[PDB]
């Protein structure tokens, strides 16, 4: 089920919970964060 805030969305980019998008980071692995 859906991935909550600040958690790794790695390998599933669509699985973020609502209001969240899966965001790739400069120095690290992608995570679910608030939409902007």
């Amino acid at each position: 089920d859906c991935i909550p805030k600040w958690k790794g969305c790695v390998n599933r980019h669509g699985d973020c919970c609502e209001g969240l998008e899966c965001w790739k980071r400069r120095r690290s692995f992608e995570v679910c964060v608030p939409k902007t």
Partner: protein
Amino acid sequence: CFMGSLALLALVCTNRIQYYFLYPHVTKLDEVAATRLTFPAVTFCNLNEFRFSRVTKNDLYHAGELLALLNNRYEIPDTQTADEKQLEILQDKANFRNFKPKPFNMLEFYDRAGHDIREMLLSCFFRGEQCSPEDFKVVFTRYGKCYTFNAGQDGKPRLITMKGGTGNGLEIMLDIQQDEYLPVWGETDETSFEAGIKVQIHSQDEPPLIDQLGFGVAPGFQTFVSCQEQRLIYLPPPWGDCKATTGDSEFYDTYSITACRIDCETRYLVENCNCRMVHMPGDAPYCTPEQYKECADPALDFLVEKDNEYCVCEMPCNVTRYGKELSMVKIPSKASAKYLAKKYNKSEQYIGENILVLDIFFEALNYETIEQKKAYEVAGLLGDIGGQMGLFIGASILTVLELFD
């Protein structure tokens, strides 16, 4: 019918009052050399967060995943890029069979395993006075354990310099200890592709944001940083946008943009993660390695790069900027290599990779001021406009007699 003209010249005031109602500012410039000049604070970080030789089984157990030396299985990943000998050591270190975990504190970890100014600092001089590791105050940053020269805190007075050039500035020689660098098997906020140090030259009243605002210094070079101090003063409203320091920051004493940002970062991290990072101010549990990974790192990364809504920092009324000119020469020369190798008991090649010299000093003109001043204050307006102003009252009071005639 100057009873027309006194109403006419009501325009002259009407304009030149309106200009004062604009509250004009002029910005004054001067560029000089100060008889004596207050040396700035110099903060630097090793680009490596944790000394390999200081990382224990307990450390590895708690912080291993964070540093990408372990997976969620508390195992050493096959992706490991390690050479034979370090892999040997790490597998041993990573063996948890019949191991019972002790308590773990992120701050203590940074403090113990962070690079030691006493090991790193080969030589130090300020103005020809020799200086020592006890001249450096420990400051925690995103980079881990960092050091600040001339921090001007704990009641130590700020250092000064009356002369331009290398000889009157700060010169340090460092060993960055690559051999002590943690192996990089993956990419986290706690890992680095780079060897060297980060440096920030700042006024003592301004805490460092060294990952954002710093500059680099590479090993295998002597780096000259020629500075000019520039002092900027702004007016508050009505004249300008600024905000005067005292009492304007939650966790800090004087107002600065960096101070405002660290405040926001801290609050945000506390709201989202319930903890604060090791380098943050305030009173709140320090994040655990897991909190770092599942909450704090993500929330902080997001806050600085992605989020433009949350932190609103007004411009300070007082800013101290340092102009910098960097240049480089090689170290060591073929001729000096063996001498250094012998002296520090290192291989000639080690010297070439790990050794740097840093010279921070001021040029002849060390001092520039850019200051907003009020262009029109309560003399100019009322002197001319307000002066002839009563003259129309003089005209009216008089011309009432043209009525009472």
